[PDB]
Every structure is written in structure tokens, then in C-alpha cells.
Amino acid sequence: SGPVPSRARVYTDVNTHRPREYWDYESHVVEWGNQDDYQLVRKLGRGKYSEVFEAINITNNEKVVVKILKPVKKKKIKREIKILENLRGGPNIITLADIVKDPVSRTPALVFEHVNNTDFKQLYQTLTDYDIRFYMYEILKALDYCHSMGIMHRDVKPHNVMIDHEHRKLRLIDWGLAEFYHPGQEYNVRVASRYFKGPELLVDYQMYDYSLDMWSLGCMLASMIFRKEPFFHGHDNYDQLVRIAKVLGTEDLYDYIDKYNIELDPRFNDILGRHSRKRWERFVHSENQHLVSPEALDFLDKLLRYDHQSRLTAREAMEHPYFYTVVKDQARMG
Ligand SMILES: Nc1ncnc2c1ncn2[C@@H]1O[C@H](COP(=O)(O)OP(=O)(O)NP(=O)(O)O)[C@@H](O)[C@H]1O
Ligand SMILES: [Mg+2]
Numbered sequence: 231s232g233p234v235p236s237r238a239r240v241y242t243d244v245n246t247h248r249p250r251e252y253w254d255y256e257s258h259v260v261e262w263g264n265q266d267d268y269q270l271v272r273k274l275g276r277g278k279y280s281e282v283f284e285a286i287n288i289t290n291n292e293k294v295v296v297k298i299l300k301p302v303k304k305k306k307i308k309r310e311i312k313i314l315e316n317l318r319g320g321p322n323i324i325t326l327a328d329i330v331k332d333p334v335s336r337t338p339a340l341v342f343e344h345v346n347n348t349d350f351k352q353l354y355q356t357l358t359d360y361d362i363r364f365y366m367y368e369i370l371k372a373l374d375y376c377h378s379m380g381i382m383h384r385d386v387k388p389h390n391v392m393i394d395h396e397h398r399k400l401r402l403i404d405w406g407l408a409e410f411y412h413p414g415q416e417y418n419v420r421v422a423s424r425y426f427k428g429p430e431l432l433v434d435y436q437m438y439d440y441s442l443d444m445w446s447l448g449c450m451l452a453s454m455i456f457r458k459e460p461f462f463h464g465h466d467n468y469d470q471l472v473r474i475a476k477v478l479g480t481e482d483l484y485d486y487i488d489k490y491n492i493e494l495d496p497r498f499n500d501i502l503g504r505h506s507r508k509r510w511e512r513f514v515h516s517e518n519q520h521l522v523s524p525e526a527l528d529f530l531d532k533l534l535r536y537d538h539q540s541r542l543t544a545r546e547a548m549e550h551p552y553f554y555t556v557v558k559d560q561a562r563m564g
């Protein structure tokens with residue numbers, strides 16, 4: 231028994247049909263900006279390989295964000311930078327504004343546009359139905375774009391989407407788990423926040439593709455419209471799968487594993503239990519129903535599918551009726 235291989239059903243050969251230089255972020259030598267253009271104002275936080283600061287560009291007094299990076303692999307730094315430069319100018323993609331190295335210690339930093347994003351509280355109490363379609367659409371543009379440019383984000387979640395609500399401004403950020411898609415390649419399933427990990431990662435199927443981001447996006451949509459964050463709340467990776475099977479049900483779980491000849495850690499077998507597929511309706515209540523509509527559920531239903539080959543692509547999703555009034559507004563004359 232070997233597992234059945236898989237390929238992206240869209241954008242499969244984007245990197246195949248581009249010069250090596252496009253995807254070979256190791257060959258890339260780096261051209262460095264000037265670290266003395268930037269003053270740190272305040273630490274915004276520490277992640278696994280970095281700390282992020284709010285800063286000011288001193289030559290022009292603009293706020294920027296500076297992500298200072300570990301002695302990490304030089305590979306990780308170069309990957310993020312290459313992906314960042316390849317995608318710059320793309321819609322709702324965060325602009326890498328500059329790259330700087332401390333010339334003595336040689337420790338790298340990335341300098342990003344600043345986004346004055348609304349507190350992930352306060353949005354919660356004010357987003358309307360129209361707001362969600364709109365922002366879901368803007369996310370889809372970024373995700374179609376990067377997918378078309380051969381890149382999986384691999385860390386789609388609400389904290390990696392910056393929204394400046396007073397400006398109706400959205401940016402997809404943290405490109406540090408992001409990677410080039412090459413068909414047939416096996417990837418690390420250690421990616422994405424737990425709550426946004428697709429089933430393919432939870433069953434340790436390594437040949438996955440852009441569809442992963444559409445799962446994570448689905449989880450986001452669910453949490454926005456049901457106002458439950460996160461929507462699937464497992465307490466570890468094992469328990470994450472179970473949270474999924476509890477809603478989508480075990481029958482399609484096992485048909486999925488069956489189809490790819492996947493075979494599970496036997497422990498999973500005892501804790502998975504047996505679960506009916508639930509109706510989306512079950513999660514709709516008085517407090518969330520103004521954000522719910524049948525097109526919203528039909529839309530969500532087509533994101534949250536066990537089978538990665540079955541999920542809506544980014545561009546199909548932008549085609550869905552759910553976005554009718556959004557696209558209608560965005561025939562923009564300018
Ligand atoms: N462009 C930006 N504008 C404003 N705030 C930002 C920006 N980028 C990051 N932040 C803040 O800093 C946090 C972390 O940014 P991120 O790029 O995800 O760091 P990371 O450590 O690489 N990711 P993770 O590994 O998930 O912790 C965000 O949740 C924001 O509060
Ligand atoms: Mg992040």
C-alpha cells in the first residue's frame with residue numbers, strides 16, 4: 231500500500247513554466263537597503279523566528295513595520311523575501327518595502343507597509359453581512375493572485391489578515407510559511423495554525439497544494455458568519471480532526487482517506503468515533519443570522535470539503551452568487 235499521489239487541479243505548472251530564477255530563491259543573492267533609515271518605536275510582539283516592531287522611516291516620517299529575524303536558515307529568509315518580491319503589487323498583498331541587514335551582527339530585517347488594523351475585538355461587534363462578503367472577496371483576490379503566481383500561503387488565519395476597517399483596507403500578511411508549488415512534491419505538514427489546518431495535514435498527506443488555503447479560508451468564513459472564533463476548536467491536532475468530523479461527519483472523512491489510500495495512526499481510529507454530517511443550519515442562531523444566507527452556506531459548504539481536489543478554487547469562489555452585490559459595486563470606473 232502506497233498513498234495515491236495528487237496534483238493541484240489549477241495553476242499546476244506555473245513554476246514549471248517560468249525561469250529558474252523565479253522559483254530558485256536560494257540562487258538569488260540579496261541586495262540590501264539601509265538599516266539607519268528606520269527607528270523602532272514599539273515591539274508589537276515575538277513569534278517563533280522573529281519579533282515585529284512598529285517603526286518610522288526617518289527619511290520621510292512614514293510608519294512601517296519591521297520584522298527582525300533570528301539566526302534562522304538563510305533559506306527561510308530568502309524564501310520569504312523571494313515570495314514577497316515576486317508578489318509585490320498584487321491586490322491586498324502586503325508590500326515588503328525594504329530589506330535591511332545589521333552590517334556588524336549581520337542580522338536581517340524585513341520592512342513592510344504599515345496597516346492601521348482594527349482591534350480583532352470591535353470588528354466582531356460591527357461587521358455587517360456586506361462587510362464580510364466584501365472582505366472575503368478581497369482575500370480571494372490575494373489568494374487567487376498568489377496561487378496564479380505559484381505560491382501557497384500555508385498560514386491563512388484571521389491574525390494574518392490585517393484589516394483597517396475605517397479605510398476598507400485589507401492585507402494578507404505573514405508570508406513566512408509560504409512556499410512555491412511544484413507538482414508531485416511532498417511538503418511539510420507542520421504548517422498553518424491548528425484551527426486552520428486542512429484535513430490533508432491532519433492525516434499527514436504531504437502532497438498537498440493551493441487548496442489548503444481554501445480550507446483555511448473556509449474556517450475563517452465559518453467563524454465570521456457564525457461569530458464563533460475559532461469555528462473548529464480542537465485542543466491538539468488529533469482533537470482538531472475530531473472537531474472537523476463532528477461537523478462534516480466521519481463517512482466522508484473515511485471516503486477521503488480511502489480514496490488516497492492514506493491509512494491512519496490507529497489512535498485516531500478510537501477517538502474519531504462515528505459522526506453524522508451536520509447541516510450548516512444547526513449553527514445559525516438569533517445573534518448570527520443577519521450574517522447568514524443560503525448563498526453564504528452554499529458557498530461555505532464548497533470550501534470545507536475533506537477532499538482537497540473538491541474544494542472551490544479561489545477564482546470559482548469569486549464567481550459565486552454570494553459575491554453578486556460585491557462584484558456589482560466593483561465595476562469601478564475610478
Ligand atoms: N503590516 C503590519 N501592520 C500592522 N501590524 C502588523 C503588521 N504585520 C504584523 N503586525 C502585528 O504583528 C503581529 C505578527 O505578525 P507576523 O508577520 O504574523 O509574525 P510571525 O511571527 O512571522 N507569525 P506567527 O509565527 O504566526 O507568530 C500581528 O498579529 C500584528 O499585530
Ligand atoms: Mg502571523
Ligand SMILES: [Mg+2]
Nearest residue numbers: 277404406407
Ligand atoms: Mg510565521
